[PDB]
Design an enzyme around this catalytic site. Sequence first.
Site, short mmCIF file in Angstrom:
data_model
loop_
_atom_site.label_atom_id
_atom_site.label_comp_id
_atom_site.label_asym_id
_atom_site.label_seq_id
_atom_site.Cartn_x
_atom_site.Cartn_y
_atom_site.Cartn_z
CG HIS A 196 -5.83 6.64 1.28
ND1 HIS A 196 -5.58 7.56 2.26
CD2 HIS A 196 -4.98 5.60 1.51
CE1 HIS A 196 -4.63 7.12 3.06
NE2 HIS A 196 -4.25 5.94 2.61
CG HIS B 186 -2.04 1.05 1.39
ND1 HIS B 186 -3.39 1.08 1.41
CD2 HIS B 186 -1.56 2.31 1.76
CE1 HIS B 186 -3.72 2.33 1.79
NE2 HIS B 186 -2.64 3.09 2.00
CD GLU B 187 2.40 3.36 3.55
OE1 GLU B 187 2.73 4.54 3.31
OE2 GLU B 187 1.26 3.05 3.97
CG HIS C 85 0.39 6.10 -0.39
ND1 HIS C 85 -0.81 6.40 -1.02
CD2 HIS C 85 0.07 5.77 0.88
CE1 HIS C 85 -1.80 6.25 -0.16
NE2 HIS C 85 -1.30 5.88 1.00
C1 LIG Z 1 -6.07 9.64 6.31
O1 LIG Z 1 -5.64 8.39 5.82
N1 LIG Z 1 -5.82 7.28 6.60
C2 LIG Z 1 -4.76 6.50 6.87
C3 LIG Z 1 -3.34 7.13 7.00
C4 LIG Z 1 -2.47 5.89 6.99
C5 LIG Z 1 -2.10 5.57 5.50
O2 LIG Z 1 -2.93 5.40 4.63
N2 LIG Z 1 -0.81 5.42 5.15
O3 LIG Z 1 -0.52 5.08 3.77
N3 LIG Z 1 -3.37 4.86 7.55
S1 LIG Z 1 -2.76 3.28 7.98
O4 LIG Z 1 -1.45 3.66 8.44
O5 LIG Z 1 -3.75 2.83 8.90
C6 LIG Z 1 -2.78 2.07 6.66
C7 LIG Z 1 -1.58 1.89 6.03
C8 LIG Z 1 -1.49 0.87 5.15
C9 LIG Z 1 -2.54 0.04 4.83
O6 LIG Z 1 -2.11 -0.87 3.87
C10 LIG Z 1 -2.97 -1.94 3.61
C11 LIG Z 1 -3.81 0.22 5.42
C12 LIG Z 1 -3.90 1.27 6.34
C13 LIG Z 1 -4.75 5.03 7.14
ZN LIG Z 2 -2.27 5.05 2.83
#
Ligand SMILES: CON[C@H]1C[C@H](C(=O)NO)N(S(=O)(=O)c2ccc(OC)cc2)C1
Ligand SMILES: [Zn+2]
Lengths: 169, 173
Positions: B129, B119-120, B123
């Site tokens: 998102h 997911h990172e 980005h």
């Molecule tokens: C405001 O955004 N909400 C967020 C901000 C932060 C994020 O997206 N980092 O990439 N989070 S998180 O850190 O909980 C998150 C990060 C990765 C993920 O991969 C499957 C699912 C959730 C959720």
């Molecule tokens: Zn994220």
Amino acid sequence: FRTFPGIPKWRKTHLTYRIVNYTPDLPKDAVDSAVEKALKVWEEVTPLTFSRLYEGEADIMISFAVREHGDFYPFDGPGNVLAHAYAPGPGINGDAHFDDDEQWTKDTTGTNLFLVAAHEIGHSLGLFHSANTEALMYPLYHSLTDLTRFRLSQDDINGIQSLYGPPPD
Amino acid sequence: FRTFPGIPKWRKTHLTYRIVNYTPDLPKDAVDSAVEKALKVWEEVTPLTFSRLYEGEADIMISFAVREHGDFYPFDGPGNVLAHAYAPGPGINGDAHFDDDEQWTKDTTGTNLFLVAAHEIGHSLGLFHSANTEALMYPLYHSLTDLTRFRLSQDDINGIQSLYGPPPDSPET
Ligand SMILES: CON[C@H]1C[C@H](C(=O)NO)N(S(=O)(=O)c2ccc(OC)cc2)C1
Ligand SMILES: [Zn+2]
Ligand SMILES: CON[C@H]1C[C@H](C(=O)NO)N(S(=O)(=O)c2ccc(OC)cc2)C1
Ligand SMILES: [Ca+2]
Ligand SMILES: [Ca+2]
Ligand SMILES: [Ca+2]
Ligand SMILES: [Ca+2]
Ligand SMILES: [Ca+2]
Ligand SMILES: [Ca+2]
Ligand SMILES: [Zn+2]
Ligand SMILES: [Zn+2]
Ligand SMILES: [Zn+2]
């Protein structure tokens, strides 16, 4: 429409095609017609012309296949992926593969060969999936009873002319 | 699928990454394998390829950090925010940071490093998102079991390909 003007389009206007094998689902005459009709949908709104070959490597090699078939993207049995094709270039590029685990039909009672082939050749010429829902390049097979109403969408024409321009006439 | 404001995207098709530090939670090889696998999901559906650097600045600097760590967004302790990454661009952009107050794990017994890393890197490659609940890019980590079944959803695929297109030798998936 979606094109990606990094990826090369064909550098020539005359392309070759070859029907490498035939599905047991249909009479060979229908496969030939469906392919011919699919190619014409594109020749009509561009200056692209096509000729058929029966031996050697044609630019666009057309074949039916099942599961693993000599490339890195095995088909998946019944439904879902119906066919796939590669963007312009040599070798496997420009080729179109059809999943024989689908029942290829001349009407809408199975997977209409013509409509999917038209979309596939789309790909063979450098068109990618459209975001526009009525476009032939939209990645969704609608069991579209009205084959009598099919018409290339303005999106499809806009996309293919972006790469090759309009017909000379 | 969503992108960052202004559609930033990498101009090179080949990116370098460097793993700057290691978490106490896992052996180094498991960290490296999770990152390789995380990069691989995107490589598989774009013309993008990646190469590892062991010194100097790679496009994508990967690190574990806790609380304040030299950037604008301090981490927050256990839970809540798990990691954060930056949009394509020079310097800090493209970097991915992971909160070490989480228990980074190879399976689901803690926070799966592979999943969040995927997911990172999303980005880092320009994707924001997804509002689509089953997309890797949906901003919620969840009660998922089968890592084995893992596959980018069509929405993630259409997002990253809207940006880079598909692999040059591949059909559109
Ligand atoms: C405001 O955004 N909400 C967020 C901000 C932060 C994020 O997206 N980092 O990439 N989070 S998180 O850190 O909980 C998150 C990060 C990765 C993920 O991969 C499957 C699912 C959730 C959720
Ligand atoms: Zn994220
Ligand atoms: C986003 O991936 N979707 C795909 C991958 C594959 C495809 O488009 N091949 O060209 N399928 S499909 O085979 O179901 C398909 C193929 C042709 C088509 O012509 C109108 C509509 C849908 C839809
Ligand atoms: Ca199939
Ligand atoms: Ca070819
Ligand atoms: Ca069949
Ligand atoms: Ca960077
Ligand atoms: Ca946290
Ligand atoms: Ca930790
Ligand atoms: Zn194939
Ligand atoms: Zn398609
Ligand atoms: Zn940070």
